[PDB]
Scaffold this active site. Structure first.
Site, PDB file in Angstrom:
ATOM      1  N   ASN A  87       0.773  -1.204   0.000  1.00 36.39           N
ATOM      2  CA  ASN A  87       0.000   0.000   0.000  1.00 36.39           C
ATOM      3  C   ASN A  87       0.821   1.278   0.000  1.00 36.39           C
ATOM      4  O   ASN A  87       0.320   2.270  -0.315  1.00 36.39           O
ATOM      5  CB  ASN A  87      -1.081  -0.014   1.096  1.00 36.39           C
ATOM      6  CG  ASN A  87      -0.512   0.096   2.487  1.00 36.39           C
ATOM      7  OD1 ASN A  87       0.064  -0.830   2.982  1.00 36.39           O
ATOM      8  ND2 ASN A  87      -0.670   1.223   3.098  1.00 36.39           N
ATOM      9  N   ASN A 101      -3.856  -1.795  -4.707  1.00 32.33           N
ATOM     10  CA  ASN A 101      -3.413  -0.701  -3.805  1.00 32.33           C
ATOM     11  C   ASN A 101      -1.931  -0.383  -3.973  1.00 32.33           C
ATOM     12  O   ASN A 101      -1.465   0.685  -3.597  1.00 32.33           O
ATOM     13  CB  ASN A 101      -3.788  -1.045  -2.363  1.00 32.33           C
ATOM     14  CG  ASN A 101      -5.304  -1.126  -2.174  1.00 32.33           C
ATOM     15  OD1 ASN A 101      -6.063  -0.383  -2.793  1.00 32.33           O
ATOM     16  ND2 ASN A 101      -5.749  -2.046  -1.315  1.00 32.33           N
TER      17      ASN A 101
END
Length: 194
Positions: A70, A116
């Site tokens: 992420n 992500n």
């Protein structure tokens, strides 16, 4: 027309994530590093593992970020800003829910379609979605709610083999990819079968 100067392979760092599907990207880079004789260096400056080789007179860098997925964009921006590599000389390798194991595909631009890693890359690079992607099929579990558990699992052996085959196919278009001939790399790649 644009030589590749950065190939990024996405993954999560750590033994708990090793060999999971969400680390397809980093498996590819890792194979690519091994095939190129490149060493990958824990470089805290780039929040990742970095190596380089010389191709057609330019350094190509390999990056495996060691931030979490992420936060991959931090790693890629640090390296690419240090070296001033524009998005269009960047290839990002990643797992792709929308293709089965055995299938690798290339794409330029577009959204992150829920990845992500890519989202973060996209935000970090001053919001540019124009980098290239090598999409490595990992299949889809067939429900949005199982996605997170799936990318974080280790695929059974047949699916792992077939990811490895798509990786070998991908590496067969390495010359076209390093040169930036996306059309030809696509023609050759998207004509293979696992």
């Amino acid at each position: 027309m644009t030589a590749v100067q950065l190939i990024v392979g996405l993954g999560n760092p750590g033994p708990e994530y090793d060999q999971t599907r969400h680390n397809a990207g980093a498996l590819f880079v890792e194979r690519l590093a091994h095939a190129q004789g490149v060493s990958l260096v824990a470089d805290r400056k780039y929040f990742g593992l970095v190596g380089k080789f010389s191709h057609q007179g330019k350094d190509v860098r390999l990056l495996i970020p060691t931030t979490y997925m992420n936060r991959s964009g931090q790693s890629v921006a640090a390296l690419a800003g240090f070296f001033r590599i524009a998005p269009d000389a960047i290839l990002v390798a990643h797992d792709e829910l929308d293709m089965p194991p055995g299938v690798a595909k290339l794409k330029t631009g577009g959204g992150h379609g829920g990845h992500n890693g890519l989202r973060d890359i996209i935000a970090q690079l001053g919001n540019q979605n124009s980098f290239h992607r090598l999409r490595l099929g990992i299949g889809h579990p067939g429900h949005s709610s199982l996605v997170s558990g799936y990318v974080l699992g280790r695929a059974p052996r047949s699916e792992q083999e077939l990811l490895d085959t798509s990786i070998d196919f991908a590496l067969g278009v390495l010359p076209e990819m390093l040169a930036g001939d996306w059309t030809r790399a696509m023609q050759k790649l998207h004509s293979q079968k696992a």
